[PDB]
């Protein structure tokens, strides 16, 4: 994910942002200058654009077991594939020799790593002093009032990060202390030797069942990862045990700080060599993290829609034997290693990547819906069902169709964040609406309806996004061309050319009408949504009438509508300064990972989904890392 | 299937009609203009010709054992010649044999029955939401003379007006299902992968996995037991809404069957995910071939309508959700015809219904065509017509289609599947028709029962007009000339049988009925088509006498005395279609939307006739099964 | 046997059929079209032919020990030949070192595998709902009534598959549970670890003595395979023990279903790597399975004659040590492996191969008897005693002489299905006959007699059978040629030409007379038996008189008897559709076996009889696989 973020703008920028919330939402502000050069008369207008985001969500999570991955053990303990070298293990150690015939090796700690990630982010948020239940923004446009419900009330919601479980009200895993060389039960054991006492306590107690107490998307409900397990440690750690039996009071046993929690993460991962599984965990957390708050009224359907996540069941063989984590670690992906090094250099790469993936996902789904019609795209590709069926490649396909670069795959099989109710282009949403005054809006029975996925963000977190083959507002610059034909009342225009002209005029300060009435563009973002009527098929020409001016006008432009006054206006848009408000630039040359004691493979296996998906000219598809 | 409808791209386009039917039947209107060119000037008549089709049928189903096919499996485990690589799947299994003995031995992937069930449910729900789903009712034949009325197993008026679930709650058992996400299969049992389906679509799929109760007389509501006794589905979320409805927890109101769009999306998602293009192609072929029959406008024509078809739908088996990595990779040797036909159906679902309408007419006409072309109007001495394609039940419908129309009939693309009529293999097959008591006029009624030999023509060719059924010019060709009689005598105007029928048809269109000897030309008003009389087929005769040509009450374009010299003029007849519309109670398609998905799909145009990937071609020597080339 | 069945017709067909019975007999129907092209006038006649089969038989089985075969152990545990590598075993493990000097290694489980095969087929038959005692058909031809006796009466015979043994009325093997690494007694032990509890129970209890309770040929009597043994399993299984001591009632302890029985078969074979021994077991079961019901009256001598089977005594060393079944399995025949993969893909390959081998065996014996005389064959080969003396190559020699392809050998030494009373050409049979009306029949003292072996089937399960070098009805097509000389009353004809003419005329619908009176051909099969008088020597010419027509006549043909009207009639016969009635096509590309972890040898050793026998021009003989 490091390559994706560092390639959205340029290899030199590498701009990162920290987590911030304000009752569950935050706003990312920008400052952008737009040019207008025509007849060697360069004009410009500098303005600020704001795209706010919300961390409130209610994703659905299913905990279903999957494949077993052993890409962290020594070379001699692995065969030519991911399967362990059982003969080597036994020629090293009996009853176990006969027992092994009945010991499946299901080692997959992705659920644990994701749990630690969300707990760390929650603790960072509460030490930042703004952790709360989280509430959706209340959007009101003079004509329509909307307010999506949330389960947990913010005011009564907790302000401090409590432990996910309860006071012994629910059962807890039967943990144990392990120091021998003989695994006694096929139940998984962990190896937490480098961890300190408090880190081990946090790990074991958070293994227990998690309860959802806030509307935060990373606060989803999760059951206990394993009913029984043991940890291979030098000493027994039992402070959390005193807490469950009802001895340690809340004040002395509180969730550990962010620094120690991140340290426990680091120790766990780089002692068990879980770089691949942690990369998968970070990918899933980034894809589940947050959604943008829509400026337009109909964009709230994106907020109401809930993702579906498939986290594999927890299993471990690392702690079963102590020599497995020794030796030379094998089959570690270079992308996973570099991503791990970067995220432990700065732990907010996940946050900035999550915001970028949210914006890219929304725009990719919407542009798939639009480019189905034939707007901007030459080839009538199978956008509907091509690479969006594969749940693991769903969000990556959306990112590829939006941005055009190689979206990083989950790196793990049978894990995905998927919107099942979004593959169809007929899917509707009933957003609650208390209409203030009647206007142009498809308001039927107190809820307007939307078709497919709407726009809820603006392509400003990722600006140079190459959505279309030709120049467009999504691209850096475009040239407004002559109309197809001019008439008395106006001129006809192609779908894309008309939208480009309307966008440029809205930035300049002109309101643009059309027939077969307004090009919508909300203030505070000044990005013109694609018109609903032109979105559908059978419409190839747009009649532009009445290019009127607005109350506030910035750049004064020719008519471009009358043949006499049309001029080849060439525009150009560049983003200058961004600052979230509820930098931190990274340096690749200082975060390079540890190549020693690690065997690194550049390529991956398509079964395990170690690759990327790129929007080819002939159609987007999955490709190998090679 | 698409190429057959488009007649191999008639101006790169064709036309389709959606399914619509009232009381189990629907008319199929037409408007044509028939010319008459004599004395170097042209007369014409514009008349509306209709055709009645019925969805009612009672085919005999046979869910017997069938072969397995692994076409939608990744390219690295299948192979064109090396076939299934069991070494590769054992390696990628993650000892090996310890998994072999459990489940890795069967390899019985076949979902044809499930796809057919989903398709018929889609059709039934379409009829339901169009306000036209009801119990079937075969029309009656009122003609003043002998009248025919047939019974129905379920009464129409008491018949249900709403498509409820096929199975009946609290009467029969259901397959035992439970979500399964384990990498390692545990029990040898069909595992079907439904991961990307929504809750309602996966619910609909697993509910249609159950057994099917017939609640109507329609031909696509045939009985079907539960496809698998036990099974498990690969899905992230455990779905039990169907299970709740199995018990009393969920009521009938809250588990109504979904809309047609939801079932269509479920079918699209299933076939796209599992790469079931060929299997769905076979399912669509079978369902269309059993869809419907044309209601005759003649008396002896109902004998064809009495017959019931026998279908070989293979027993269900799914090995695609056992291993997640089976579908990871481009599909193996998917037929190009299957891909294009799948894209066409998903774009326009009415293609299956239109192809069914075309196939019913083509088959009913081609059975008559073969019963005649075997003897060649009785001037063929030996048995060197090679009609043996009619023998094996699989190429029955295909051979009938190829014999009726010169186009290559599409093979079923699957082995041990067919739609066949066992008792009509031989052309000397007698059938009895229950008949009401009315005085006769030469309908050879025996014991108050029409005795019918062979198979009768029951439909007009107006939906496939360029049929080219016969070699010579004729009404089937559309344009023909009427020549002078061979020689004139007292009885009058010796005519060859085929030319006599051509003259009779043209005169009946023009408003003159004709009298023959060795007596008239009983035809239909609504459908001014005159079906070929038995003197053409019998082959005992080679010349026929036309005694008098009289004027009907409904006179039309005026002609001279054709059956006499010094008065006959060589009129010529040409007809063109003005407007066709299938009403009851259209959607243009061109070859622009045919473009199939070729991203990550290995496509082979060639096929092997062992698996029935070809097309039967009619030549002058006879029929012949030809591969896909 | 897969190559034989798939080569009888063509590599593409591969047609298989399931087991079905109707009071012990079933009928296989066909639909065949016969052509008659002459003077460019192609005529044809389509008709159905039915050849019924019977599963009732009383074979004689002798349980005599033979060679010890060790072609399933690892490479290091075997020497350059089948003998085990005793030095390698001992340098792996003592008293055993001294004990071994007195441990013969007799490992041969063919009797066990055959017992499981017959039990599985019986359970399939009873779950099909038609299992019974089985009764021979009662054939009656208006002139003669015959009904062969059977020991068990069908009506009182059991309808459900009971366990072969009794209620502790007979003694049972003293089984034991083994888990150590030390074999305590030279008594054999088995290794049944992958088997479940019920599969182990079925295996051990069916090891006990088998009792014949029905007239079925696969229900032959067999004693207990071993008085003592032990099974190497994780746990003791004793439900069948409770059954023998008289505790578990019949209802809870019933014979396992077909699926679990086949699963036990699969587990046993592919864990002990008994592919060769199982191939031998399937061969023997196929050769013993069934016989055809004869349409002609004198053909019932084939029914009365009983085969002789030599099953080796049961012995096992697989369960003695647990490491033997590990490693790389050695010396596995490719034919055996592919046959095993096919039969576990579909378990009815054995049934279809058994029906084919029955038809081929009868026709091969009869054609050996006929071709002794000189009918059709040029060389007076030693058909009487050449390759029919070797009991193991008896049935294979019959198949080779019939069909002409390579009959698959038993793949095991000192095992055979042999008819000792059939090598002579003078062997007679006294079939019981209640004669209805006197006619042409050699009826002496209430029993007609037959000489040698008669025809009891028709070559329709295997049609393209190349019995003779020249064209014939057994071949696809033949041309009726001009007579040697024409006389006033008729024309003379060679033996084979006269029989070809008579067969063609009977298919057409003409009855053919001859002198030095009728060419017999029964309806429902319309295949003309070779005339008895022309069968013997010293007769080279046949006088054909009076080619009269029949009651039902299909194809109208020239006289072919008078020189004026003789025409070069060319016939052609093809089979279109078959359907047994008391398909299932196989696909070779999907049933390919597991080549990994198995060492496969194409060639075999003539001592062990790993080969095939082909009818060469100069004479049939055994050849190697090479």
Numbering used by the authors:
A (entry chain A), C (entry chain A): 1 to 93, 105 to 527, 535 to 600, 608 to 651
B (entry chain B): 1 to 94, 104 to 527, 535 to 601, 608 to 651
Per the authors:
To derive solid molecular insights into the L-A virus structure within the cell extract, we acquired an additional cryo-EM dataset at 0.93 Å. A high-quality de novo model was built in the derived 3.21 Å L-A virus cryo-EM map (FSC = 0.143). The backbone was explicitly traceable; the α-helical pitch and β-strand separation were both discernable. Side chain densities were clearly visible, which allows us for the unambiguous placement of most side chains. The icosahedral protein shell has a triangulation number T = 1 organization, consisting of 60 structural units, with each unit comprising two chemically identical capsid proteins, formed by 120 protomers, with overall diameter (400 Å) and thickness (46 Å) comparable to its crystallographic counterpart. A similar opening diameter (18 Å) at the icosahedral fivefold axes was observed that is hypothesized to serve as a gate for the exit of viral mRNA and entry of nucleotide triphosphates. Detailed analysis of the L-A virus identified previously undescribed stabilizing cation-π interactions in the capsid that mediate interactions within and also across L-A protomers. In the asymmetric unit, 26 side chains are involved in forming 11 distinct cation-π interaction networks, formed within monomeric and dimeric interfaces (examples are shown in Fig. 2c). Structural changes compared to the crystal structure are detected in both capsomere subunits, specifically in loop regions (R94–V104; Y528–K536, G601–H607) of protomers A and B, respectively. Specifically, the flexible region spanning residues 528–534 encircles the active site. This loop element undergoes dynamic changes as it was not Cα-traceable in the cryo-EM map; however, in the crystal structure it was resolved, pointing to a regulatory role in the binding site accessibility.
